Homo-oligomer: A and B are copies of this chain.
Amino acid sequence: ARTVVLITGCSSGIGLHLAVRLASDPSQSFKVYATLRDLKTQGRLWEAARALACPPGSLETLQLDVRDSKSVAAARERVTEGRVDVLVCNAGLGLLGPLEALGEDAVASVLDVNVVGTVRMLQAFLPDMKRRGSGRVLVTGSVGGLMGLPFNDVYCASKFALEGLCESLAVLLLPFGVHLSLIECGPVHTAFMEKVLVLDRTDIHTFHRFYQYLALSKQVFREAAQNPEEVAEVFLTALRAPKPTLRYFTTERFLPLLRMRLDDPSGSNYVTAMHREVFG
């Protein structure tokens, strides 16, 4: 009990790890409502929770498909404390591919989950934190949300959108007690990439470039990808702040890339640097 937390997308990767990290906190002060798109996939979560030995009642899972506003309401109605102190917007999908090759459904789907879904959670939940003048909104950051990456145009679009959405609300919410923070992450070892996935819809040059990008991402992800457990610690950090900043970074690694991006509004610099980073 105390500190009701409600996290989205906890079947795996980040959701699952922060769920049980929070529920197994030595302080025992968190009540965790791990929500998932489909409960039948909750095996691992529970096994992890069970393996960690969490106070009974410290974990509860609800079904919440962030792309359905009815699902959202319902789960909210299932939070018995009638309050959420920490709201975690963590679900999201990637989408890779030459822009001309991406399909309408995939595009829409990405935007609906990553952006539109955070919008739904907040509408359903800001109100009562604002009214209670207390609440903490933590949103899962992503680096392809801070800078453009070749072949991930739509993913990046949907990921920059969260920044924008988040940045607008913090400008407002400051005064109401509610604090929003993004936990920005680089590659992380989750279920993410395995799910993320042309010849007939792209031209020979983009095609070969695609394949060249592809190969490299995978080698690099494997080299940089952090642990999903490393990332929960950052969410804990932020949520431990007395006055939390709007950005928390899970690694210093992209920092350098970011600064030369910001050091040049025309953007010509980043473009060249990123083209060479990706195609040598």
Contacts and interface: CB of A to CB of B under 8 A. Distances in A.
B164 A156 contact: yes
A115 B108 CA distance: 10
A152 B172 CA distance: 10
B153 A203 contact: no
Interface of A: 69, 99-100, 102, 104, 107-108, 111, 115-116, 119-120, 122-123, 126-127, 130-131, 144-145, 147-154, 156-172, 174-176, 203, 205-206, 209, 245-247, 249, 255, 258-259, 262-263, 265-268, 270-272, 274-275, 278-279
Contacts of A170: 148, 267-268, 271
Number of copies of this kind of chain in the complex: 2
A9 B62 CA distance: 44
Q: Is the interface of A mostly helix, strand, loop or mixed?
A: helix
Given A100-B123, A130-B203, A157-B115, A148 B164 contact: yes
Nearest to A145: B164
22 contacts: A99-B122, A99-B123, A99-B126, A102-B119, A107-B119, A119-B157, A148-B171, A150-B168, A150-B171, A150-B172, A152-B168, A153-B165, A156-B164, A156-B165, A160-B163, A160-B164, A161-B161, A171-B275, A245-B268, A246-B267, A246-B268, A246-B271
Contact of A130 (B111, B152, B205, B278): B205
A55 to B, nearest CB: 33
Contact of A262 (B104, B152, B209, B263): B263
Contacts of A111: 111, 115-116, 161
A192 to B, nearest CB: 18
A172 B96 CA distance: 13
A272 B246 CA distance: 11
A148 B119 contact: no
Given A165-B156, A247-B266, A209 B150 contact: no
